[PDB]
Structure 1
Amino acid sequence: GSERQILRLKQINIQLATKIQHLEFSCSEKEQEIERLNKLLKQNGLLG
């Protein structure tokens, strides 16, 4: 009944919240990778 429907909604909820946490962490790591590449470009005279 409703108890089981609730449990399943909570499992889906945690799966979605975990994927969000992963994608926020992956986006942050990629912005750090972009900073590091841009700094290398700057140093080699490729960013003005």
Structure 2
Amino acid sequence: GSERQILRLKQINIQLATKIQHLEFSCSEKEQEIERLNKLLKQNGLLG
């Protein structure tokens, strides 16, 4: 009964650990874009 949770949680945790690495890269990619756009605004006089 109860012990069957062990494999379920082990496998879910592996999936979640992988998902964290894919979201870290996606978030980082968006940060690089924000920096690029900020610079473009700054070079054009529009970032204060």
TM-score by length of 2: 0.78
Aligned length: 48
Deviates more, 1:22-31 or 1:2-11: 2-11
**Structure 2 residues without counterparts, runs of 5 or longer:** none
State the distance in 1 between where 2:40 and 2:3 align: 56
Distance in structure 2 (CA, Å) of the matches to 1:12 and 1:6: 10
- 1:10 shift after superposition: 1.7
Distance, in Å, in 2 between the alignment partners of 1:35 and 1:13 is 33
Shift of 1:4: 5.1
Q: What's the counterpart of residue 10 of structure 1?
A: 10
Where does the alignment leave 5 or more consecutive residues of structure 1 unmatched?
A: none
What TM-score does the superposition give when structure 1 sets the normalisation length? Answer: 0.78
